[PDB]
Amino acid sequence: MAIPAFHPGELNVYSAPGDVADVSRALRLTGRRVMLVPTMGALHEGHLALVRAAKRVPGSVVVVSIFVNPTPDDDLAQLRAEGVEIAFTPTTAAMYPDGLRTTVQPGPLAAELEGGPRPTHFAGVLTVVLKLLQIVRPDRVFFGEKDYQQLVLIRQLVADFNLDVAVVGVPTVREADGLAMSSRNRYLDPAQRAAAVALSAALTAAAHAATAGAQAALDAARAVLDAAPGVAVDYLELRDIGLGPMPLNGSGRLLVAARLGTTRLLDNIAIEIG
């Protein structure tokens, strides 16, 4: 049948999975490399940084998905401002025309860490990321490193189901005092917002303490969080980069999550032991 209209150099918006699927396939056949940036709308500078990373690939056409897995005007304007040529904005019914039926079951990592208060969260994530990658068939898909467990789970999905996409993690964009960017940050009151910096300050102190070994890094991060009031830490864990157990020597990742009033914040950093 006829390819949907696509106007190069402007923001083309599709809601129908089949429409974006046909346009992506037509573009790829024309010598473009399809880049997917999955979002849930409400775009912030962290999403812009995903887009800029995608746009850097020569020959790129950038597809930004906006889907809340169960404001439009402003998101699309930001996308236009960034030179993004494709926005995919499906309804829940278009993504799930048969309801919830076959789904993705993550490996046991999805039960750990975030998987504690939210046991089925990552099955949902992995299911819609899978569907997005099958609809759009991108050459590369971009995610921020803030939701680091999510990123690892995505790389396990890609390995395990033999998907033909490159997973690109982009360093977390941070506020000027280091607080990782988040939709949730606007909910903090001024005391909570001041206390919230302890997450990024604990992890950066740990990254530097790590020359003295893993225990020093963990104790430094704990002392920073202990200097903050009304920061209820859920976990502070050193793991290897794939979120297995931290090797005695080598590269790793330090992850923290805490509740400030009603707001849950997460951060993580690269750690190099000794």
Ligand X SMILES: COc1ccc2c(c1)cc(C(=O)NS(=O)(=O)N1CCOCC1)n2CC(=O)O
Under the rule (CB under 8 A), what is the footprint of a copy of itself?
17, 21, 97-98, 100-108, 123, 126-127, 130-131, 134-135, 137, 153, 156-157, 159-164
147 is annotated as contributing to ligand binding: yes
Quick one: which of 13, 49, 123, 233 contacts ligand X (CB under 6 A)? 49
CA distance 260 to 184: 11
From CA 14, how far away is CA 6, in angstroms rounded? 10
First-to-final CA distance of the chain: 60
| CB environment 82-100: b (16+ within 10 A), e (fewer) | bebbbbbbbeeeebbeeee
Q: Does 270 engage in binding with ligand X (CB under 6 A)? A: no
What is the side-by-side strand order in the sheet with 263-272? 232-239, 251-260, 263-272
- 144 touches ligand X by CB under 6 A: yes
CA dist 123 and 105 (Å) reads 6
Rounded Cα distance between 234 and 200, Å, is: 15
**181 near ligand X, judged by CB under 6 A:** yes
208 among known catalytic residues: no
Catalytic residue among 7, 47, 121, 208: 47
Please tell me whether 181 is known to bind a ligand.
yes
146 binds ligand X (CB under 6 A): yes
75 contributes a contact to ligand X by CB under 6 A: no
Residues that bind ligand X (CB under 6 A): 39-40, 42, 44, 46-47, 49-50, 144, 146-147, 150, 170, 172-173, 180-184
Report the binding-site residues for ATP: 40-47, 144-147, 173, 181-184
Report the binding-site residues: 40-47, 74-75, 78, 144-147, 150, 173, 181-184
Catalytically active residues are 47
